[PDB]
């Protein structure tokens, strides 16, 4: 077997050059396809060219930053020193300019829009003040992250809701997701037949969850998700001054569920502080996961609003966490350790697809059973309350009626008008007591009723509300914060870090309340930027 030994020696001697040459050939082939497509027709091949250009730009950028980091830092150092020298007097100028800009924006846009937008701004202030007053350590508050998070939310809102470029970008992004969720029908039609639409939720909506989980697992294998997470976390870390671990988890929670996002920093969990743990749980509670987005879109909820709320929730979560539970210890973990995310044990892409599919079994099972139980309990509670109410000649008593009054002030402060605040309060109650699936289903009912065009009042009962109120409700309801998920959150986090069971239990309720407040802050900003139609 002399030839085999020669082949093995040749392979060993120049292993690095052989695989690099192969990869170069593949890249050259892809570029040849792109250039030929552009040559044959450019307008038809434009999106492929755009994708290739942006990918090349990002690759070159990352290589340069990795290679020339020291030189760039040294080059930037002098300006930082000069700014540090003049900051003692320049801080007042910068702060005054920012305050003046806020006042001008209010006077010349928010007042023009109407009273409800000003009420949204007031509600923003009031929620922040209530967070401060009931803070764990009111005297230890570091105010930089709070203002920076609120400012980042405002800037994202201006970019996406008040500019044609961002509005178009996110409408397009939402439309792509709607196209993407239709591919699951191919599998649903085989497994459950051409009559799979006879059972819409079970045989059409849950397969969307399965498919989305599969795709997310594939993307995690390929390493794209970690790349986006690192970028967003770096932005939040450099502006708000938050710790690397909580920034990474907050950025990750945009795409990943509360129970799986801490796995990004699993090794370092035992050494995190109390504040970072609170921030982790709050970020978990203030966001949703990319596996359940398609279901909410299938109900009829706006995709663009869901994506915008998911993006805006992270800085809100971090600001509210730092205000509610500020840092009184010294963090141990550093940036390099936090940013490295131990990938899963998948040898190839198809194994990642199978692992993503298998994990989705319990998710859909629990979703279905929880919905069954919650809706049966709702029916029983309404029947019991009607039974009790009839003893006072008020058989209309219901869970919805009580929630329409209990939660109305929260909706009013978010900028919802007087009439529609009572309807939004019912959705808040549904989310608080059962979950966000039920609330989004009811919101989809209201949206469909509005879209039909029927009467707005029948026998004195309002049937549907305005579109602005629907957007505000979409922002308010985007989260996994409910009283029933406290146990699963605590259990999973203890499983990852058994030593910290005592600390985890202490901060969980405060974290849930903070997540709710963060969703309401996102809703307040959306309300103050949207106009009355």
Binding site for ligand LBN (CB under 6 A): 95, 98-99, 102, 105, 142-144, 147, 150-151, 154, 176-177, 179-180, 212, 215, 290, 383-384, 387
E strand residue ranges, 19-141: none
Nearest residue (CB) to Na ion, 308 versus 469:
308
Q: Is 502 in the site for a copy of itself (CB under 8 A)?
A: no
CA distance 30 to 517: 48
Q: Is 210 in the site for a copy of itself (CB under 8 A)?
A: yes
Interface segment toward a copy of itself; rule CB under 8 A; list 83-91, 282-290, 342-350, 413-421: 342-350
Which one of Na ion, ligand LBN, a copy of itself, none interacts with residue 479, CB within 5 to 8 A by kind?
Na ion
Which one of a copy of itself, ligand LBN, Na ion, none interacts with residue 144, CB within 5 to 8 A by kind?
ligand LBN
| Residue among 393, 453, 458, 533 that touches a copy of itself (CB under 8 A) | 393
| Residue among 105, 147, 192, 271 that touches a copy of itself (CB under 8 A) | 192
Six-digit token string for 476: 């308010």
| Residue among 80, 328, 334, 383 that touches a copy of itself (CB under 8 A) | 383
Nearest residue (CB) to ligand LBN, 37 versus 102:
102
**Residue 484 in contact with residue 271, Cβ under 8 Å?**
no
Nearest residue (CB) to a copy of itself, 409 versus 484:
484
**Residue 215 in contact with residue 306, Cβ under 8 Å?**
no
Nearest residue (CB) to ligand LBN, 107 versus 369:
107
Nearest residue (CB) to ligand LBN, 252 versus 290:
290
Q: How buried is residue 401: exposed, middle or buried, by Cβ count under 10 Å (0-12/13-18/19+)? A: middle
Interface segment toward a copy of itself; rule CB under 8 A; list 96-104, 246-254, 376-384, 445-453: 376-384
Q: Provide, rounded to whole angstroms, the least separation between the CB of residue 212 and ligand LBN.
A: 5
The phi and psi torsions of 355 (rounded to 5 degrees) equal: -65, -40
CA distance 253 to 106: 32
Which one of a copy of itself, Na ion, ligand LBN, none interacts with residue 102, CB within 5 to 8 A by kind?
ligand LBN
The phi and psi torsions of 273 (rounded to 5 degrees) equal: -80, 175
Which one of Na ion, a copy of itself, ligand LBN, none interacts with residue 214, CB within 5 to 8 A by kind?
a copy of itself
Which one of a copy of itself, ligand LBN, Na ion, none interacts with residue 356, CB within 5 to 8 A by kind?
a copy of itself
Residues that bind Na ion (CB under 5 A): 253, 286-287, 313, 478-479, 519
CA distance 208 to 216: 12
Q: Which residues contact 489 (CB under 8 A, 6 or more apart)?
A: 258, 259, 281, 284, 285, 508
Which one of a copy of itself, Na ion, ligand LBN, none interacts with residue 17, CB within 5 to 8 A by kind?
none
* CA dihedral (143, 516, 473, 183) positive or negative: positive
Beta-bridged to residue 458, according to DSSP, are 461
Nearest residue (CB) to Na ion, 45 versus 292:
292
CA distance 93 to 101: 12
Q: Provide, rounded to whole angstroms, the least separation between the CB of residue 433 and ligand LBN.
A: 16
The phi and psi torsions of 17 (rounded to 5 degrees) equal: -70, -35
- Show contacts with a copy of itself in window 163-182 (CB under 8 A): 180
CA distance 215 to 512: 29
- Show contacts with a copy of itself in window 79-108 (CB under 8 A): none
Cα radius of gyration (the chain): 26
Three-state secondary structure string covering 353-414: HHHHHHHHHHHHHHHHHHHHHHHHHHHHHHHHHHHHHHHHCCCCCCHHHHHHHHCHHHHHHC
| Residue among 487, 499, 531, 532 that touches a copy of itself (CB under 8 A) | 487
CA distance 394 to 457: 21
Which one of Na ion, ligand LBN, a copy of itself, none interacts with residue 210, CB within 5 to 8 A by kind?
a copy of itself
Q: Provide, rounded to whole angstroms, the least separation between the CB of residue 273 and ligand LBN.
A: 18
């Amino acid at each position: 077997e002399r030839m085999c030994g020669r082949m093995s020696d040749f392979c060993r001697e120049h292993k690095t050059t052989l695989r690099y040459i192969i990869w170069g050939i593949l890249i050259a082939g892809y570029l040849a396809l792109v250039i030929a497509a552009c040559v044959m027709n450019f307008h038809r091949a434009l999106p492929l060219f755009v994708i290739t250009v942006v990918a090349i730009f990002f690759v070159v950028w990352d290589h340069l930053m990795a290679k020339y980091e020291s030189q760039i830092a040294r080059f930037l150092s002098p300006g930082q020193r000069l700014l540090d020298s003049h900051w003692f007097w320049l801080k007042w100028v910068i702060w005054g300019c920012l305050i003046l800009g806020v006042i001008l924006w209010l006077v010349f846009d928010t007042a023009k829009l109407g009273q409800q937008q000003l009420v949204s701004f007031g509600g923003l202030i009031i929620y922040t003040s209530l967070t401060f007053l009931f803070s764990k350590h009111p005297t230890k508050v570091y105010w930089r992250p709070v203002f920076w998070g609120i400012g980042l939310q405002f800037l994202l809102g201006l970019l996406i809701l008040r500019t044609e470029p961002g509005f178009m970008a996110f409408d397009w992004l939402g439309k792509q997701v709607q196209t993407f969720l239709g591919y699951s029908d191919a599998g649903a039609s085989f497994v459950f037949g051409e009559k799979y639409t006879d059972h819409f939720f079970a045989f059409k909506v849950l397969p969307i969850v399965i498919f989305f989980s599969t795709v997310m697992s594939m993307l995690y294998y390929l390493g794209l998700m970690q790349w986006i997470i690192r970028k967003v976390g770096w932005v939040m870390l450099v502006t708000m001054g938050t710790s690397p671990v909580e920034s990474v988890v907050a950025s990750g929670n945009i795409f990943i569920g509360q129970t799986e996002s801490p796995l990004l920093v699993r090794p370092y969990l035992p050494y995190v502080t109390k504040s970072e743990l609170h921030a982790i749980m709050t970020a978990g509670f203030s966001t949703i996961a990319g596996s359940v987005l398609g279901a909410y879109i299938s109900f009829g909820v706006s995709s663009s609003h869901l994506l915008t709320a998911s993006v805006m929730s992270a800085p809100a979560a971090l600001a509210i966490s730092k205000l509610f539970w500020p840092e009184t210890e010294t963090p141990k973990i550093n940036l390099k350790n936090a940013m490295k995310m131990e990938s899963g044990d998948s040898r190839n892409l198809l194994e990642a697809a199978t692992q993503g599919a298998s994990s989705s079994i319990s998710l859909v099972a629990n979703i279905a059973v929880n919905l069954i139980a919650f809706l049966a309990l709702l029916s029983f509670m309404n029947s019991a309350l009607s039974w009790l109410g009839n003893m006072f000649d008020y058989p209309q008593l219901s869970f919805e009626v009580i929630c329409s009054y209990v939660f109305m002030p929260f909706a009013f402060m978010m900028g919802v008008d007087w009439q529609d605040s009572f309807m939004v309060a019912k959705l808040i109650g549904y989310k608080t007591f059962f979950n966000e699936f039920v609330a989004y289903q009811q919101l989809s009912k209201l949206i469909s009723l509005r879209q039909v065009g029927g009467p707005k009042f029948v026998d004195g009962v309002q049937q549907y509300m305005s579109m602005r109120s629907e957007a505000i409700s979409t922002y308010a309801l985007c989260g996994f914060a409910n009283f029933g998920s406290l146990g699963i959150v605590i259990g999973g986090l203890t499983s990852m870090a058994p030593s910290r069971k005592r600390d985890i239990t202490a901060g969980a309720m405060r974290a849930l309340i903070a997540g709710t407040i963060a969703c309401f802050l996102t809703a307040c900003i959306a309300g103050m930027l949207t106009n009355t139609p």
